[PDB]
Write an enzyme that holds these catalytic residues in place. Sequence first.
Site, mmCIF file in Angstrom:
data_model
loop_
_atom_site.group_PDB
_atom_site.id
_atom_site.type_symbol
_atom_site.label_atom_id
_atom_site.label_comp_id
_atom_site.label_asym_id
_atom_site.label_seq_id
_atom_site.Cartn_x
_atom_site.Cartn_y
_atom_site.Cartn_z
ATOM 1 N N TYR A 10 0.812 -1.212 0.000
ATOM 2 C CA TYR A 10 0.000 0.000 0.000
ATOM 3 C C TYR A 10 0.853 1.273 0.000
ATOM 4 O O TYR A 10 0.587 2.202 -0.774
ATOM 5 C CB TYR A 10 -1.015 -0.013 1.156
ATOM 6 C CG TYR A 10 -2.270 0.762 0.797
ATOM 7 C CD1 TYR A 10 -3.072 0.347 -0.266
ATOM 8 C CD2 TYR A 10 -2.636 1.906 1.492
ATOM 9 C CE1 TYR A 10 -4.211 1.052 -0.630
ATOM 10 C CE2 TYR A 10 -3.771 2.611 1.141
ATOM 11 C CZ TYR A 10 -4.555 2.189 0.082
ATOM 12 O OH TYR A 10 -5.674 2.908 -0.269
ATOM 13 N N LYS B 209 -4.519 8.365 1.283
ATOM 14 C CA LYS B 209 -5.817 8.174 1.923
ATOM 15 C C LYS B 209 -5.921 8.955 3.237
ATOM 16 O O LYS B 209 -7.001 9.439 3.572
ATOM 17 C CB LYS B 209 -6.122 6.693 2.155
ATOM 18 C CG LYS B 209 -6.346 5.871 0.880
ATOM 19 C CD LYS B 209 -7.503 6.402 0.029
ATOM 20 C CE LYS B 209 -7.914 5.362 -1.010
ATOM 21 N NZ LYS B 209 -9.033 5.838 -1.899
HETATM 22 N N1 LIG Z 1 -11.033 -2.339 -3.959
HETATM 23 C C1 LIG Z 1 -10.594 -2.167 -2.674
HETATM 24 O O1 LIG Z 1 -10.195 -3.113 -2.009
HETATM 25 C C2 LIG Z 1 -10.713 -0.823 -2.065
HETATM 26 C C3 LIG Z 1 -10.749 -0.695 -0.660
HETATM 27 C C4 LIG Z 1 -10.952 0.566 -0.115
HETATM 28 C C5 LIG Z 1 -11.044 1.676 -0.947
HETATM 29 N N2 LIG Z 1 -10.936 1.541 -2.298
HETATM 30 C C6 LIG Z 1 -11.054 2.787 -3.140
HETATM 31 O O2 LIG Z 1 -12.258 2.692 -3.872
HETATM 32 C C7 LIG Z 1 -12.122 3.549 -5.020
HETATM 33 C C8 LIG Z 1 -12.519 2.740 -6.280
HETATM 34 O O3 LIG Z 1 -11.531 1.819 -6.531
HETATM 35 P P1 LIG Z 1 -11.982 0.307 -7.160
HETATM 36 O O4 LIG Z 1 -11.362 -0.682 -6.219
HETATM 37 O O5 LIG Z 1 -13.439 0.371 -7.448
HETATM 38 O O6 LIG Z 1 -11.138 0.175 -8.510
HETATM 39 P P2 LIG Z 1 -11.478 0.672 -10.007
HETATM 40 O O7 LIG Z 1 -10.241 0.625 -10.810
HETATM 41 O O8 LIG Z 1 -12.770 -0.006 -10.394
HETATM 42 O O9 LIG Z 1 -11.949 2.292 -9.812
HETATM 43 C C9 LIG Z 1 -10.865 3.192 -9.770
HETATM 44 C C10 LIG Z 1 -11.360 4.400 -10.569
HETATM 45 O O10 LIG Z 1 -10.431 5.499 -10.471
HETATM 46 C C11 LIG Z 1 -10.479 6.091 -11.732
HETATM 47 N N3 LIG Z 1 -9.352 6.984 -11.972
HETATM 48 C C12 LIG Z 1 -7.978 6.776 -11.832
HETATM 49 N N4 LIG Z 1 -7.261 7.817 -12.261
HETATM 50 C C13 LIG Z 1 -8.216 8.738 -12.729
HETATM 51 C C14 LIG Z 1 -8.128 10.022 -13.324
HETATM 52 N N5 LIG Z 1 -6.930 10.608 -13.539
HETATM 53 N N6 LIG Z 1 -9.255 10.681 -13.685
HETATM 54 C C15 LIG Z 1 -10.434 10.061 -13.454
HETATM 55 N N7 LIG Z 1 -10.670 8.856 -12.923
HETATM 56 C C16 LIG Z 1 -9.522 8.218 -12.568
HETATM 57 C C17 LIG Z 1 -10.341 4.834 -12.682
HETATM 58 O O11 LIG Z 1 -10.593 5.179 -14.021
HETATM 59 C C18 LIG Z 1 -11.424 3.960 -12.089
HETATM 60 O O12 LIG Z 1 -12.683 4.284 -12.614
HETATM 61 C C19 LIG Z 1 -10.616 4.031 -5.038
HETATM 62 O O13 LIG Z 1 -10.503 5.282 -4.369
HETATM 63 C C20 LIG Z 1 -9.925 2.964 -4.205
HETATM 64 O O14 LIG Z 1 -8.765 3.423 -3.545
HETATM 65 C C21 LIG Z 1 -10.811 0.303 -2.905
#
Ligand SMILES: NC(=O)c1ccc[n+]([C@@H]2O[C@H](COP(=O)([O-])OP(=O)(O)OC[C@H]3O[C@@H](n4cnc5c(N)ncnc54)[C@H](O)[C@@H]3O)[C@@H](O)[C@H]2O)c1
Lengths: 260, 260, 260, 260
Positions: free
Chosen positions: C157, C164
């Site tokens: 991470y 975050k």
């Molecule tokens: N999956 C997990 O385990 C987890 C846990 C906690 C939090 N999160 C957070 O949840 C959120 C969604 O992540 P996810 O796991 O659904 O993965 P994901 O890849 O489906 O979604 C990530 C999104 O960020 C967008 N993104 C990245 N750079 C960008 C930019 N420059 N302009 C616009 N959009 C941009 C991507 O296009 C994508 O749509 C993120 O903030 C991630 O850190 C994920």
Amino acid sequence: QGLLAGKRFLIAGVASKLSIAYGIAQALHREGAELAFTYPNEKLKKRVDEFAEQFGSKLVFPCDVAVDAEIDNAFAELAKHWDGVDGVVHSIGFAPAHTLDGDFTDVTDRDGFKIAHDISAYSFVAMARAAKPLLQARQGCLLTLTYQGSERVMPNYNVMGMAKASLEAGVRYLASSLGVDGIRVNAISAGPIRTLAASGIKSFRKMLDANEKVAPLKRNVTIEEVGNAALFLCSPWASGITGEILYVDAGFNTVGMSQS
Amino acid sequence: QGLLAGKRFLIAGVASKLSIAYGIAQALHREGAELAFTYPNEKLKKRVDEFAEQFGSKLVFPCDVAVDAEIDNAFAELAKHWDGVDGVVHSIGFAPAHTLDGDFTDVTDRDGFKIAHDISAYSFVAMARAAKPLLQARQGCLLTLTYQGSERVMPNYNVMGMAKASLEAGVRYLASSLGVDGIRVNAISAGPIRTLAASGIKSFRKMLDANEKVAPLKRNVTIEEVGNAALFLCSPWASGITGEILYVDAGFNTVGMSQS
Amino acid sequence: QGLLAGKRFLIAGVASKLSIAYGIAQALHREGAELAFTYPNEKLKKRVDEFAEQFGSKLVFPCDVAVDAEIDNAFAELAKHWDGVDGVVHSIGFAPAHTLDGDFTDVTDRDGFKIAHDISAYSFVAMARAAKPLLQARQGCLLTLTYQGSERVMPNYNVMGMAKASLEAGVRYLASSLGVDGIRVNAISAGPIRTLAASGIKSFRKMLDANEKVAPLKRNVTIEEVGNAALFLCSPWASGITGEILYVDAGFNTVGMSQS
Amino acid sequence: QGLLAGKRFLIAGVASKLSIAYGIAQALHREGAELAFTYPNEKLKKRVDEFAEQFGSKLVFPCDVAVDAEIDNAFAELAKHWDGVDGVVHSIGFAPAHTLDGDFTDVTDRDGFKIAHDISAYSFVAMARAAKPLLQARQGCLLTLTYQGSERVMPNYNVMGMAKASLEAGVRYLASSLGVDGIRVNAISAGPIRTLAASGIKSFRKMLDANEKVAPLKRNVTIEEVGNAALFLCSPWASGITGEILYVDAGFNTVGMSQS
Ligand SMILES: NC(=O)c1ccc[n+]([C@@H]2O[C@H](COP(=O)([O-])OP(=O)(O)OC[C@H]3O[C@@H](n4cnc5c(N)ncnc54)[C@H](O)[C@@H]3O)[C@@H](O)[C@H]2O)c1
Ligand SMILES: NC(=O)c1ccc[n+]([C@@H]2O[C@H](COP(=O)([O-])OP(=O)(O)OC[C@H]3O[C@@H](n4cnc5c(N)ncnc54)[C@H](O)[C@@H]3O)[C@@H](O)[C@H]2O)c1
Ligand SMILES: NC(=O)c1ccc[n+]([C@@H]2O[C@H](COP(=O)([O-])OP(=O)(O)OC[C@H]3O[C@@H](n4cnc5c(N)ncnc54)[C@H](O)[C@@H]3O)[C@@H](O)[C@H]2O)c1
Ligand SMILES: NC(=O)c1ccc[n+]([C@@H]2O[C@H](COP(=O)([O-])OP(=O)(O)OC[C@H]3O[C@@H](n4cnc5c(N)ncnc54)[C@H](O)[C@@H]3O)[C@@H](O)[C@H]2O)c1
Ligand code: NA
Ligand code: NA
Ligand code: NA
Ligand code: NA
């Protein structure tokens, strides 16, 4: 059909229409839940019967949480009607008046400490144990009410801060113990709300006014807002959430110092 | 001349040479402090007399913290010798063995809860009140020992987690109450250390091994490290610090998940 | 009529059917919301058009959050259709792959740090500012997604933990800034979920398995559970809640050490 | 012989005699440490030369933490004199003035965010990496300065709250990365202190007055108190402590609401 259609909840802690427990009852019932209630002593029985009737319930049982046998008996009586329960709401706290008024070091005696912790913290553990078989049958949940005097010094609170800190740790230990059964255990940390607890407490108005100035939303929360948060935590929508202390305080806890 | 030359501290909680309180005594004495000690019951008197002699002290008093009169009397007796005290160290905790072994919901009975909280949390408040006049005379401080089972679920801990959460809130309420007198109130949250508490507890070895793997420093802390942190918190170098829970756990608390 | 009948939400962050943002969209739409979506670059446009159609929406706009003009333009375009918005969901994060694989001190370069913070934390602030007029019109809310690597060290991470932590402080500062307008600002701290982010990351399976063993519920959360929590925080039932980080992690965060 | 006799520390962040870094230098030197210093730009060189001379040091090097090469070069130059270092003190922070004055949502632009995070958070990581070989040689430690605006909203702080939250997570990730080498990494969260940062900031007086009323000790902390806490964290007495944010704020952080 509401979010809680076909579901059953026991509510412990209704005292008046201002009670947090009353607002929780209203919200659960609004979404289709069937309810049951406890009352602390004989003097409160008729009032609680009346409140229960407002929610179409005749399931009303004595439960003084100071008494092991009464806790056990309340759940034995409930089990004559219900073969399982979807949740138990603990909205019970108390400390002797003298412990809440004055200098913490001077006024916190052993018996005052004992009572505050017994009624405000231990009782949630005892109720969880007594409720366990009914909760297991429906993978039901537990909910309690806490206050942020546990984490930071709040006025006119004293030993209740210790007791709420104990309670919040109890939420976590219960969640780890009962999670294997699919039983979630959470709390709401409510902002200050005028209830029977504040009656005759002259400073409460000033504390509410101060809360209103500090809170990001610039207003005080209501039992309807606490009730809706409780509804959420008692619902399938919160199935991913356990051991959580959810703050419903209009953001007050997030502010270190306010402008003016 | 040591950092604590001319200063006086009361140490409550020596049981054996492994005691956290023993390590604290060693560090304070190393830096020039004069010490006094309490013992919990008659069976421990001669052992505590011996420990006190190791630190050049003959100030040894009975103090079972279950008994109001004994707490008061310990400080009345101390006051015959000392007209002021620079600090009081509370290194006292207890819960009945049955409460620490098994499922939290099943084993946490009312009396077990009561004892854990009375001895482990309330006693610090009671000792602070009894010590207040002597502390006021030198603007002395208070220190207690806590464990991070208060904040997150730790194994084989159960109701002690509730009691330590209560204790830590007590640290904060005491700090706000006594701060006007110049009296600081703090705690050390120690990582696990083998002491008399672990004797006969088969799982302790495994828990220490797990701690050692997770901690950023990849080792377990010692009473010398806890003692030196206590020395700091009891010294003029900590004059800006009150209400603080200082973690001395080799960083364990900061890790959410370790590699392997 | 669903809980969100007549309400409007913009969803930023759909990438695939596994996306947290997709699960949030499903839940909001299930309860009657009308939706709009952004896509990050031209290569994603057709896929996002398809996802939006699944929710009966043709409101799809480019928004690379690295570019000030694109953020502003996305909201200007949305405003041609909507004279107010009930909420904006930010489900966007990124750090260069090299920053997430290896020793933190060795691999955290300036540009990697900059990108992680710009895309994962600053972008929420920028979107809040751009959304402010539409949010003011309906007293709408903001929601972002965070992870508990902010508060404790989690594997693989690294700098994302810093980003975050920045984001979560942003939630609080935004809540204090926008609260006067009646605009609530919250986050969900989700437990680990397999999404596009984990594709090709060999260790993800092991981390999920470890999560499953530690979590009080003894299972991993889903986008349906995160989606329902998001629904709650975006609804009138959460009107008393702002500045909050709500954990939807099956209780993982509450455990300090698990048995075995 | 002082507690730090024979030990060596690099101090980054002296600007004037009011600087937190100056108070830290004084305390370390008082206990026998040999010191080295950095200066941010040529205009500060002669002043920093003068300050260093006050502590018997001629080890003074340029280090603008915006520039990778300067960080690397500062440690390469130091290594010509020292074959190992016992600690590195990072007392460096900055955000453009406009970001700290006004509504958070309105004034937090991308470049302002970038600078705040680059200088106030990333720079600690970069300095840790550059210092690693010298720290490894003596199992030395790292220390940074943070402020509780990271955890709760504090006035006139805005994006600096995000940057300090990032920094504090950095403390934890660094502690986990470098702990295997025996390198401890900690921070002090100082209460407000008048330094060069407050010059011309009209509201600072009012904020100090408010701090003084809320803090349990009913006074403001000094660089001497921060310096002594830094001395502790940089000493063998803190060998059991890593990843810790130690509050030196006269207890301010522990109060939720003060009387009046
Ligand atoms: N999956 C997990 O385990 C987890 C846990 C906690 C939090 N999160 C957070 O949840 C959120 C969604 O992540 P996810 O796991 O659904 O993965 P994901 O890849 O489906 O979604 C990530 C999104 O960020 C967008 N993104 C990245 N750079 C960008 C930019 N420059 N302009 C616009 N959009 C941009 C991507 O296009 C994508 O749509 C993120 O903030 C991630 O850190 C994920
Ligand atoms: N009102 C607030 O500002 C506020 C804020 C946060 C949390 N809380 C908590 O919410 C809960 C409900 O309090 P309220 O404000 O609704 O006041 P209330 O007086 O309406 O409810 C308190 C309940 O505790 C019950 N109780 C006390 N001793 C009992 C016993 N021995 N056996 C059984 N029941 C007993 C009372 O009978 C009453 O029903 C309490 O835990 C309180 O600490 C209140
Ligand atoms: N050892 C650990 O791993 C650890 C970790 C964190 C905190 N702690 C805390 O440190 C403190 C010291 O514990 P220890 O590990 O040194 O064990 P210990 O057994 O050496 O000390 C415990 C002390 O509590 C005293 N005590 C118990 N009941 C008492 C009573 N009624 N009246 C007076 N004294 C009484 C015992 O006599 C003994 O002196 C306790 O609060 C314990 O919870 C221990
Ligand atoms: N004074 C307070 O109330 C307070 C409270 C908590 C924390 N802090 C923190 O303490 C630390 C010291 O601040 P201070 O109050 O002593 O003020 P100060 O102005 O004396 O020290 C700030 C230092 O940061 C250095 N700096 C800024 N940009 C730099 C760059 N690009 N390269 C190198 N050095 C750079 C400045 O030159 C100066 O030496 C900062 O991190 C500040 O955030 C201050
Ligand atoms: Na008080
Ligand atoms: Na257990
Ligand atoms: Na790593
Ligand atoms: Na502001």
